[PDB]
Design a protein around this ligand. Structure first.
Ligand code: ZN
Ligand code: ZN
Length: 204
């Protein structure tokens, strides 16, 4: 069920510690040899492999300066670590780093809550960036993944777009139990206009 302590613990650990988060501005990919569903980057001192769902997404960022905002998992192999993998999280760089406050509407066990917000400075952001910033907020404010009282067990993060298209994320999706399994959902690298949507969260 959604009351599995291990999974809740790993899901929380994944979104709580910034250690797992890879944030880099105006970066360009390494001229390495890659497949058609990935792009190798060198962020900080780590080697990062960014995977995408479709093969046409790669071509769009190749040798172009991009902004990265994605969660990552350590790839385990018989070599000197430093190998990390992430899904999506890429958008072309931008000179308009202006601040945008995305309204976050939380329904806490049926009760409407006071207006909350998350900030982003890209005019076009990825769903993943929004989902990450929201979950960090819910963890801090409501402790939705707690393993002592386990007050919460169901919830959804809904990106309510003005274009009649909704992106839904289940706050209690554990994949198979591994981080890459939990992060694969962001592989579509879907992006959206920062000012054309708001967030609706339901937790119980
Ligand atoms: Zn709405
Ligand atoms: Zn709508």
């Amino acid at each position: 069920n959604s009351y599995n302590t291990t999974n809740r613990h790993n899901l929380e650990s994944l979104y709580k510690h910034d250690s797992n988060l890879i944030e880099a501005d105006s970066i360009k990919n390494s001229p390495d040899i890659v497949t058609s569903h990935m792009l190798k980057y060198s962020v900080k001192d780590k080697n990062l492999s960014v995977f995408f769902e479709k093969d046409w997404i790669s071509q769009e960022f190749k040798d172009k300066e991009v902004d990265i905002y994605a969660l990552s998992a350590q790839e385990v192999c018989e070599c000197p670590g430093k190998r990390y993998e992430a899904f999506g999280g890429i958008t072309l760089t931008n000179s308009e780093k202006k601040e945008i406050k995305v309204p976050v509407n939380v329904w806490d066990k049926s009760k409407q809550q006071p207006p909350m917000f998350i900030t982003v400075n890209k005019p076009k952001v990825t769903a993943q960036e929004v989902d990450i910033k929201v979950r960090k907020l819910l963890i801090k404010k409501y402790d939705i993944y707690n393993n002592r009282e386990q007050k919460y067990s169901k919830g959804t993060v809904t990106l309510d777009l003005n274009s009649g298209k909704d992106i839904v994320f289940d706050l209690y999706y554990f994949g198979n139990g591994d981080f890459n399994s939990m992060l694969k959902i962001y592989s579509n690298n879907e992006r959206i206009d920062s000012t054309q949507f708001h967030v609706d969260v339901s937790i119980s």
